[PDB]
Design a protein around this ligand. Structure first.
Ligand SMILES: Nc1nc2c(ncn2[C@@H]2O[C@H](COP(=O)(O)OP(=O)(O)OP(=O)(O)O)[C@@H](O)[C@H]2O)c(=O)[nH]1
Ligand SMILES: [Mg+2]
Lengths: 109, 190, 305, 245, 158, 65, 79, 103, 42, 135
RNA sequence: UGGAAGUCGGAAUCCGCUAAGGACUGUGUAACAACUCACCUGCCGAAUGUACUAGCCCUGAAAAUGGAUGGCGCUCAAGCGU
């Protein structure tokens, strides 16, 4: 049956009350030996993109392919000296990781 | 719709003899004589003018009218075969293994035979038996070329297609392997 | 040892067609309303599980075959960073993995619902819902699939450079005879044409010296400008010079028929010499049928000294 | 009639002209008549007709029409009852085949002298007679096909080799070079494109155009001219020989 | 003694246009640095503009000449303030050029235009200016061309 | 979902909280920024289920604004 | 398809009595449901019907237009 | 091999001698093949083929329409701030099918 | 001889004519008169 | 290659799946337990079996402990089931024994104790090189 | 843009000579070149083109022993409409 109360807000709360409730409830979660009383009647519902940006700025078609317009690579170095340092530390990290994996006929099931 | 009368005309040169008997056309000229049985198509032949063959269909449909163009082109091709002849020049190219082509005349069957060897290094010997009337010659003017000559366009072109289709590269990239025999030129002997 | 073993990556529509084709043709398709409801549930559950298994197998085949940038040599990692946007590469493969995991979650949820479905119509609607959600998830991958197919073909055509072996590295300006040198000393088929930037990708050939196998790497030419202005074609050469412990042969044309000045070539050499630490540098002066060192000006000879 | 040829719709900017182009031609021809003293009829038969732009530029004070022959005849007026000016129906008898109109105010002697000494070497069309024998030598095929010495010729482009094979030359691709026979010019004879005193067909003329060999000439022949003052048509030399309708 | 004519596109006040020339002028016996200095001296009064340059080669020397192009003349007549190519890009030519300067450019291009009249040359220059994207007399060059057809704007004869 | 307000078929179905077509549910609309005239956050609002969840595997609803 | 050398199971055109009765019942119910939807349909229906007109290939279409002319002229004169 | 080696192979050696002729003849026979597919495919393959052909016909018709006119709203006038806007307090679905207790 | 080329390469093929089985059923001038009458009618 | 020797004449297969044979080399294993043979066909209820010179998959049950965690390819060199050669000789060895090799046939061990079969020596040249007695 | 000349991209897409020709439809070049399409002219000779509508026909989804317009069989019917 049509009724006016279908199109009204059913639960409302103010800014300061919501903030105080959240702060007090967070302080209650800080203690694991303190539990609520009548938790079923409490408003617990109130308590409880880099990839997208890169794809938006540069599409896959403009990156690589027959219609690609990409011409300038994205680098982590600026001049030749930091390029040499980057290569040196990259080789050192690669060798260290390989030694770590080495330290860490098929096998039986 | 059934068209009451439809007609086609074939001009005949002076050196051609055409004999039609129960839709069996026999065309004889300077180079030779050909025969073809066209009894599977309902058509009436007549002599409309001197040196002119008339083909007519009565009370036929559009398909029956359109078949006269095929009959006209077939008889014209027979006339062109007995007057000027037909010649297909084919070229066989290779990348690494030289393709060896031998031509001989099997006299017992009265027909030419072509043997193809070393096609991409294969040890098998491919053999193509010509239709009778088709003569095979290894061309001396150009390099790696066969010449197929005859009076029957169907026989010469079918022999050429057999030579193309017996040399096919299998299980390889056709962009990379371009070996084979291909029909380079089609034309008349005279 | 090459990346030719990557299976071909279809488009979104081709992927949907393939998965639904195996689902249609590799499973029985006749079920009757007069059968037992457990039998109907088993039928549609098998359909959903088979579709998920096909999708997961294909997605795992795509992910497990593409190279992992963190586990490559720094030369290969930075070379793939030059050729392909490494961010875009990782985003595409992460979206593939995300779609795989979401397809698995959708399949598990709809199998759980098919456990409680009570009629053949409800089971059919649940199966169609699961398959439509999987098709929508695949359709949201139109661009990464095309990108990964192009990357796969380029990786399959990429040469094999061993980062730690006896290796010569030819570098310099365009039109100085690098490709002619590599053709003369190796069996590699690198084009030699008078225009600049004829070589657009790294070529590698091989030779033998004292019964030892050497690899020789021909690189695209490098121009004289700061590193921020360098495009990908020259940055392939810059990556090869930076990350490969090689014998660098810097080729110079003193005749200046390459279109560049000797001062510019010397300036580029002095700019890239920090990368030449712990590497063996040989300046090879080419084209002496045109002009020679003694025919050069004394100040240029002094600067080269 | 289900079995029919699929009529291809063209996704290009330029459309069919139609009747409006004919009406525009009628208006232009019927408006250039009362401004020029003489109207010449010229003929260019079996010619490429691409130097008419240079002729139009050189004769800036003249007006040249090269539309449809029947359209130009009906524009000038075929019968004396419909002619725009007196004597134009006499001029319309020369408009057959590939002809054109030249409205001018210059001296007819000057026009005849200009179209006499005007001559540019041009590619031959099908139906012309070959003035000489042209043969591409065996070996590496060059751009001119042996017209210039081979030491001063660039090799022919590799993309033209399928076109030469389709046009009948048995060339082949060796090491990126289009070669006739072998690389060193052996095991084959030269390819004779045309023989002297032989009617050229489209295949031979296209081969000569690809090899940049010109075996014809561009001659504009004046048939006659109508004068506004005298109201009469004076017939020139080529007009007697050329058929009239 | 043979005379060879080579047409090229170059930026004025630049040397690197001869980088592409040295593949072909090198076999001809020319000095690429000398050719670059010559084209820089010839195009010193076309700074920052793409300008067609003709090189005439005979007896192993080349003389440089500037072949005018309508787009370059319109861009120069726009009087765009001096700038460097490498730092800022994607620029637009949206300044104004006067109709008198357009007619002067057409008079410069009477040797290239095949039009019967200076009005036809002026309209060609207006079409080129419309392609460039500038404005003439504060209005659209297409609008001025349509006004020239309509007849209220009169182009002087020759 | 905060509560099931009315299942139109049977009050027992509402007591059991059954989500079918035409069911009024109460949803937390805190993520939509619906605010009262003075600044109070409207965090509970009715909505109607407009699909068949037992055949679709999901609950689709329309706000009663 | 390898149908000539190895035909598959034939499709029977011999109708089943149960199938025919069910199809007849379903057809009657479809006719009834279409009647109900036609009665409850809110889609607009023009009272006037669009005239198909006179074919162009009729050779006396001119003449028909003439007696239409003096028919309407005589009607206007009489009115 | 390395890089665009098939393209380099085509540059140095060309393609097959009948490749252009075979491609042209295949493009010519495409109409016959399409009609044979429309009149001879069976079952689900035929249904998918028919649906895809309907899709291409719709797309081609729209493309032809767009090339044809390359060269060429509520009732009551309301201002810009009243656009895209729309008693009885009824729900969107006031009546649904009742569910029996066996269901 | 034939001064042109054929695309398929069948140089022996004759200069075919248009397949018009309804040829000769009417004349050109009569068709022009009918065209004028249909234009006035429309 | 799936370790299937070519050119092997048919003989009696005396070692089915589940058999335990001696480990004849010095790789450190004392016995081998057969879990599959290479080149076995598909047949209902039939246990795969192998003879002398056949490559099998085996697990180490007695021996050095780091051999007990993997599945090794092995070649059977001796069997106790009598088999016939092409010269009409029916023969059998004192015990069932094999050697651990790689998938390519190269031996992991360095020497062989006791004789090896003619068929094994024929189909595996490394066993013929590391064998002392060939029977 | 390293190179981009109608034909890797973004935005515009005008004028002249016109009989007609898009700041271009594809092939092609590193870029050019070259070929081709749209459009026009010459030869020819009289009817065509587009989209719909109504009939019959093909497809428009099928499992599992060997079979069914009732069966043979029927093709200007022994099928379909009057
Ligand atoms: N006279 C002479 N000309 C040379 C010599 N070496 C190379 N050239 C010419 O210089 C041009 C340089 O072409 P490449 O050999 O490809 O040099 P490059 O373009 O820098 O090499 P890439 O960057 O790998 O493409 C060639 O076309 C040769 O014609 C030489 O030693 N003497
Ligand atoms: Mg180069």
């Amino acid at each position: 049956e049509p009724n006016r109360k279908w199109f009204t807000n059913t639960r409302v709360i103010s800014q300061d009350t919501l903030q105080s409730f959240r702060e007090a409830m967070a302080e209650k979660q800080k203690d694991p030996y303190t539990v609520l009383l009548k938790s079923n009647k409490l408003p617990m519902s109130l308590i409880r993109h880099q990839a997208k940006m890169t794809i938006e700025r540069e599409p896959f078609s403009e990156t690589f392919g027959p219609k690609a317009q990409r011409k300038r690579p994205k680098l982590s170095f600026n001049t030749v000296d930091e390029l040499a340092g980057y290569s040196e530390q990259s080789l050192d990290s690669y060798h260290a990781r390989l030694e770590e994996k080495k330290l860490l006929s098929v096998a039986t099931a | 719709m059934r068209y009451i009368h439809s007609e086609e005309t074939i001009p005949v040169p002076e050196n051609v003899k055409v004999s039609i008997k129960s839709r069996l056309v026999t065309v004889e000229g300077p180079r030779g004589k050909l025969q073809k049985d066209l009894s599977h198509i309902a058509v009436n032949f007549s002599v409309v003018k001197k040196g002119v063959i008339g083909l007519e269909i009565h009370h036929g449909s559009r398909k029956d009218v359109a078949a006269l163009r095929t009959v006209r082109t077939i008889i014209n091709n027979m006339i062109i075969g007995v007057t000027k002849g037909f010649k297909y020049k084919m070229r066989y190219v290779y990348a690494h293994f030289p393709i060896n082509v031998n031509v001989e005349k099997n006299a017992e069957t009265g027909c030419y035979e072509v043997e193809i060897r070393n096609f991409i290094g294969e040890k098998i010997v491919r053999k193509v038996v010509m239709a009778p009337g088709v003569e095979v010659e290894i061309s001396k003017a150009q390099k790696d070329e066969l010449i197929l000559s005859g009076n029957s366009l169907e026989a010469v072109s079918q022999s050429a297609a057999d030579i193309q289709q017996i040399c096919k590269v299998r299980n390889k990239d056709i962009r990379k392997f371009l070996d084979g025999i291909y029909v380079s030129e089609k034309g008349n002997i005279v | 040892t090459g990346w030719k073993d990557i299976p071909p990556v279809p488009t979104a529509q081709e992927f949907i067609d393939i998965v639904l084709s195996r689902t249609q043709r590799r499973l029985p398709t006749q079920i009757r309303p007069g059968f037992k409801i457990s039998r109907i549930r088993a039928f549609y559950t098998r359909k959903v599980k088979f579709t998920q298994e096909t999708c997961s197998e294909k997605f795992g085949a795509i992910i497990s075959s593409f190279p992992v940038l963190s586990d490559q040599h720094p030369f290969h990692r930075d070379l793939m960073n030059i050729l392909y946007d490494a961010d875009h590469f990782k985003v595409a493969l992460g979206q593939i993995s995300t779609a795989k995991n979401l397809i698995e979650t959708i399949s598990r949820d709809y199998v759980r619902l098919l456990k409680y479905a009570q009629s053949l119509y409800q089971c059919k609607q649940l199966k169609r819902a699961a398959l439509g959600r999987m098709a929508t998830l695949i359709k949201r991958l139109k661009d990464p699939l095309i990108y990964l197919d192009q990357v796969r073909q380029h990786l399959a055509r990429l040469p094999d450079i061993n980062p730690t072996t006896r290796t010569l590295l030819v570098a310099g300006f365009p039109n100085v005879g690098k490709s002619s040198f590599v053709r003369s000393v190796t069996r590699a088929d690198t084009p030699v044409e008078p225009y600049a930037f004829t070589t657009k990708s790294l070529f590698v050939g091989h030779l033998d010296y004292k019964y030892l196998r050497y690899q020789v790497i021909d690189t695209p030419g490098i121009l004289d400008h700061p590193l921020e202005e360098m495009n990908t074609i020259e940055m392939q050469s810059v990556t090869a010079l930076a990350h490969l412990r090689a014998a660098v042969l810097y080729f110079m044309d003193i005749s200046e028929q390459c279109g560049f000045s000797l001062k510019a070539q010397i300036n580029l050499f002095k700019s890239i010499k920090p990368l030449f630490a712990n590497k063996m540098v040989f300046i090879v002066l080419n084209k002496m049928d045109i002009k020679k060192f003694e025919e050069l000006d004394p100040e240029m000879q002094q600067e080269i000294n | 009639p289900k079995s029919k040829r699929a009529r291809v719709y063209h996704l290009t900017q330029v459309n069919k002209k139609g009747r409006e182009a004919k009406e525009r031609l009628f208006s232009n021809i019927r408006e250039t008549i009362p401004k020029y003293q003489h109207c010449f009829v010229f003929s260019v038969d079996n010619m490429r007709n691409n130097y008419l732009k240079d002729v139009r530029h050189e004769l800036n004070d003249c007006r040249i029409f090269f539309g449809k022959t029947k359209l130009m005849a009906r524009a000038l007026g075929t019968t004396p009852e419909e002619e725009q000016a007196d004597g134009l129906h006499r001029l319309t008898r020369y408009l057959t085949g590939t002809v054109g109109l030249l409205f001018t105010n210059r001296d007819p002697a000057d026009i005849e002298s200009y179209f006499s000494n005007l001559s540019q070497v041009d590619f031959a069309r099908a139906g012309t007679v070959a003035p000489r024998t042209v043969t591409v030598p065996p070996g590496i095929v060059y751009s001119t096909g042996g017209e210039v010495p081979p030491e001063h010729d660039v090799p022919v482009s590799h993309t033209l080799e399928p076109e030469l094979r389709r046009l009948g030359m048995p060339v082949r691709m060796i090491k990126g070079k289009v070669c006739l026979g072998d690389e060193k010019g052996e095991a084959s004879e030269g390819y004779t494109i045309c023989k002297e005193g032989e009617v050229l067909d489209s295949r031979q003329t296209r081969l000569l155009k690809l090899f940049s060999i010109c075996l014809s000439e561009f001659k504009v022949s004046l048939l006659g001219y109508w004068s506004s003052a005298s109201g009469e048509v004076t017939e020139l030399e080529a007009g007697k020989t050329r058929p009239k309708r | 003694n043979e005379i060879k004519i080579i047409h090229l596109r170059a930026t004025g006040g630049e040397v690197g246009a001869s980088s592409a020339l040295a593949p072909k002028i090198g076999p001809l016996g020319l000095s690429p640095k000398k050719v670059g200095e010559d084209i820089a001296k010839a195009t010193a009064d076309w700074k920052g503009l793409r300008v067609t340059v003709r090189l005439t080669i005979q007896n192993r020397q080349a003389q440089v000449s500037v072949v005018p192009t309508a787009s370059a003349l319109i861009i120069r007549a726009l009087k765009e303030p001096p700038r460097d190519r490498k730092k800022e890009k994607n620029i637009k030519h949206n300044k104004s050029v006067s109709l008198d300067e357009i007619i002067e450019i057409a008079r410069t291009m009477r040797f290239k235009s095949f039009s019967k009249d200076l009005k036809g040359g002026v309209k060609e220059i207006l079409g080129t200016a419309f392609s460039v994207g500038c404005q003439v007399d504060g209005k659209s060059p297409k609008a001025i061309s349509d006004a020239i057809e309509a007849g209220e704007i009169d182009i002087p004869d020759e | 979902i905060l509560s099931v307000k009315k299942n139109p078929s049977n009050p027992l179905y509402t007591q059991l909280g059954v989500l079918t077509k035409g069911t009024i549910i109460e949803v937390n609309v805190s993520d939509l920024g619906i605010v009262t005239a003075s600044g109070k956050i409207a965090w509970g609002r009715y909505a109607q289920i407009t699909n068949n969840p037992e055949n679709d595997g999901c609950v689709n609803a329309v706000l009663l604004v | 398809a390898g149908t000539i050398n190895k035909p598959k199971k034939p499709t029977s055109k011999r109708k089943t009595t149960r199938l025919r009765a069910k199809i007849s019942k379903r057809a009657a119910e479809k006719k009834r449901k279409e009647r109900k939807l036609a009665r409850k349909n809110p889609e607009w229906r023009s009272k006037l019907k669009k005239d198909p007109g006179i074919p162009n290939l009729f050779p006396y279409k001119e003449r028909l237009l003439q007696q239409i002319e003096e028919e309407r002229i005589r009607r206007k004169e009489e009115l | 091999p390395q890089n665009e080696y098939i393209e380099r192979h085509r540059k140095l050696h060309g393609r097959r001698l009948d490749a252009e002729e075979r491609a042209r003849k295949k493009a010519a026979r495409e109409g016959h093949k399409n009609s044979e597919n429309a009149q001879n495919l069976r079952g689900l393959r035929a249904k998918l083929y028919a649906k895809q052909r309907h899709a291409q016909k719709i797309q081609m018709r729209k493309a032809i329409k767009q090339h044809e006119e390359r060269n060429v709203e509520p009732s009551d006038p309301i201002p810009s701030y009243l656009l895209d806007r729309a008693a009885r307090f009824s729900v969107p679905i006031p009546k649904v099918r009742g569910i029996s207790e066996e269901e | 001889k034939n001064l042109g080329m054929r695309k398929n390469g069948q140089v022996w093929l004759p200069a075919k004519k248009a397949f018009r089985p309804t040829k000769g059923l009417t004349s050109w001038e009569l068709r022009v008169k009918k065209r004028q009458e249909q234009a006035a009618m429309k | 290659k799936r370790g299937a020797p070519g050119g092997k004449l048919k003989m009696t297969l005396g070692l089915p799946v589940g058999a335990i044979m001696n480990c004849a080399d010095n790789s450190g294993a004392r016995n081998l337990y057969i879990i599959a043979v290479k080149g076995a066909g598909a047949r209902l209820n039939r246990l795969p079996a192998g003879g002398v010179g056949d490559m099998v998959m085996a697990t180490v049950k007695k021996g050095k402990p780091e051999l007990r965690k993997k599945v090794h390819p092995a070649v059977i060199v001796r069997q106790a089931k009598p088999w016939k050669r092409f010269d009409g000789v029916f023969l059998y060895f004192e015990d069932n024994a094999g050697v651990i090799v790689n998938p390519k046939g190269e031996m992991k061990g360095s020497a062989i104790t006791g004789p090896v079969g003619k068929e094994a020596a024929e189909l595996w040249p490394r066993i013929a090189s590391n064998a002392g007695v060939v029977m």
